[PDB]
Point group: C3
Chain length 240, copies 3
């Protein structure tokens, strides 16, 4: 298990989709400040902090912009915990194939396309999951189809890898994306995979999601992932 | 036939997509107030009302927000009739597979996905219409594929049913959505089907549309439709 | 070859996607005014013009709105050349299947659908490229499938043709769209095809793009293209 409050480091068991409540009771009644008052009575946050969560705007897109701005795990986690306690169905919706919290990433995944799916479209991910949206298959042949192709053409690994990141930040802004970026900067891509696997376990029915995630697990295994270097705005998303 | 002006109740023959003009002449010249002046000279509305349609903003998204706000059939129908007389190609575009009035719902249908299509993707709706966008088939097997699956898992009926509503309001905001919601609150889902069928008859070529509509006709037949209860904002969309 | 600066007429070798740099060095450092200062030192533009490119707003959507507003080839080309020198990866992204400069047209192509794909979906474009997104095929059967269908129903040529234009302007706003519109007004559609072919040559890997472009090359061959007449806003996009 994990104590996300005592931890001064981000650990994968503490990223947003793993720490959200599983379900909710009355979302319309709660506000950020009320749920923060509750964390204070729990002795998780101070009364000072709870009165300081007005830093999240009234709107949801704003709250997320603030959360993304944070430069420490303590602050980012506190804001995420208030946020997801007010929107308690936020990651609950990822249990299904639609939802408001999914709009950004589904749109992105169905619009921005990978280069590998263009180069050879025979692989079941491209021709079955991304197109047909089925994704009920547990069996993808990733290696047979894509290994030599990424081996040869490195800039299409660069493109597909950065695309995978853009999508991941649209799905899970905050701690989860920061954890992933961080394992990449350190030149240890595969240590993100553990988190990804735990994410898969939470949303068994989101078939598009599971497919995309398995593809990312794949890209992270490629040697080319350890040679990838981050653009300046990605580096900015990290911690001080 | 129907007299939509004498009616003090919403009837299905009077919902927006059925009452729009079939085609247009010069749309650029007309404004809301001009077409309202014409309804007044027709003795359908009073000169007072015609001078009161500035309540629709200059923009189209605003006019629709106002129309949706109305709490009576008389007012909602009056505003819809002015609106669709200014945008006289509005539902004309639904005769085809593209158009400005379609942007919201097509985007939604291709982005937000149903849970049934994830659970078993073999059914021709999922694997042929939603993915491949063909939908030229008249034959869907809905019962063989989906009956036992919705029977067992009720929360995926809940999700897919609310999704179907979100899409319907994106396609046909106003009277048509209010008529549908109302038949649902009354615990008589299948009485909406008649309207849906008339809608199908108007846009034979919009194959995505016809497919989605047939799916909704299906969901409305399930016992689970009569047990569905509406979230507060849906109830707000109804009439006083 | 072509001298795009001495030319007082728009030629196809001078449209935006053909004249963009192929790649970039440091995009974050440059602004419109800096790259315009560089064109001035090159003796391509006057110092007056370079100090006049503040007419492009700070944002990118605004710069594009201004570029589209221009009523001459000299001005439109000057603004495009500054613009694409600041965003030097703009059409570089079209070498791949994702990117910021692609968001508008991919969204449009996957959301707004053609009438032909609804009428008979057997043709490989509809059932393979638009749906499945593969598009690795060089072989489309366009004639066998679509010739008699557009022959008979003229309003679906009208719809699919205007759709093709809406998409083209989302992909290549500015000179390329103006060149295309112009060849259409003059009742010489097929003279746009040359440009389209050169565009195909620049982005071999963008399979969706190549497919859509081949479809437009097809529509431009149909007699019905020479009978098409432009709506007023299309005519407004042209030159004085
Ligand atoms: C497909 O590729 C993976 C990993 O990619 C390779 O990694 C390097 C060893 C190098 O060969 C690169 O060009 C490739 O991109 C292979 O799996 C890894 O193999 C290494 C070999 O030492 C092993 O140590 C790792 O544990 C393996 N797994 C990883 C990195 O996740 C894999 O074998 C290739 N072939 C098939 C059929 O999958
Ligand atoms: C598939 O389901 C429909 C309706 O769903 C069922 O309705 C209840 C009777 C109950 O069995 C629920 O668990 C199901 O969800 C079936 O069609 C209806 O059957 C009833 C039986 O009394 C009949 O009165 C209705 O008129 C039928 N039609 C409707 C409601 O539109 C249908 O038979 C099932 N099987 C197949 C193969 O379609
Ligand atoms: C499919 O159609 C193209 C062009 O469309 C036809 O053009 C007219 C001649 C008329 O028949 C319209 O109803 C059609 O829409 C055919 O190709 C053209 O044929 C003309 C004949 O004179 C020739 O001059 C052009 O060069 C041809 N190519 C063009 C216009 O790009 C084509 O033959 C038709 N059939 C097949 C199998 O492709
Ligand atoms: Cl979050
Ligand atoms: Cl309406
Ligand atoms: Cl441009």
């Amino acid at each position: 298990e994990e104590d996300c409050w005592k931890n001064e480091e981000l650990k994968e068991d503490c990223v947003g989709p793993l720490i959200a409540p599983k379900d909710c009771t009355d979302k319309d009644h709660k506000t950020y400040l009320s749920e923060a008052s509750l964390l204070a009575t729990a002795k998780k946050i101070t009364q000072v902090d709870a009165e300081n969560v007005e830093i999240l705007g009234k709107t949801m897109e704003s709250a997320i912009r603030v959360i993304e701005r944070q430069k420490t795990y303590h602050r980012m986690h506190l804001l995420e915990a208030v946020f997801l306690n007010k929107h308690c169905d936020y990651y609950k919706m990822f249990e299904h194939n639609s939802g408001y919290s999914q709009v950004k990433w589904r749109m992105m995944i169905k619009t921005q396309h990978f280069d590998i799916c263009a180069l050879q479209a025979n692989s079941p991910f491209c021709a079955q999951c991304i197109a047909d949206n089925s994704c009920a298959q547990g069996s993808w042949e990733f290696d047979t189809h894509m290994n030599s192709t990424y081996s040869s053409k490195v800039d299409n690994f660069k493109h597909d890898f950065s695309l995978f990141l853009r999508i991941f930040e649209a799905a899970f802004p905050g701690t989860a994306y920061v954890h992933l970026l961080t394992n990449i900067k350190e030149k240890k891509p595969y240590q993100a995979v553990s988190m990804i696997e735990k994410i898969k376990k939470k949303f068994p029915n989101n078939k598009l999601l599971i497919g995309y995630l398995d593809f990312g697990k794949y890209l992270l295994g490629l040697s080319h992932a350890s040679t990838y270097e981050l653009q300046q705005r990605q580096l900015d998303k990290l911690y001080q």
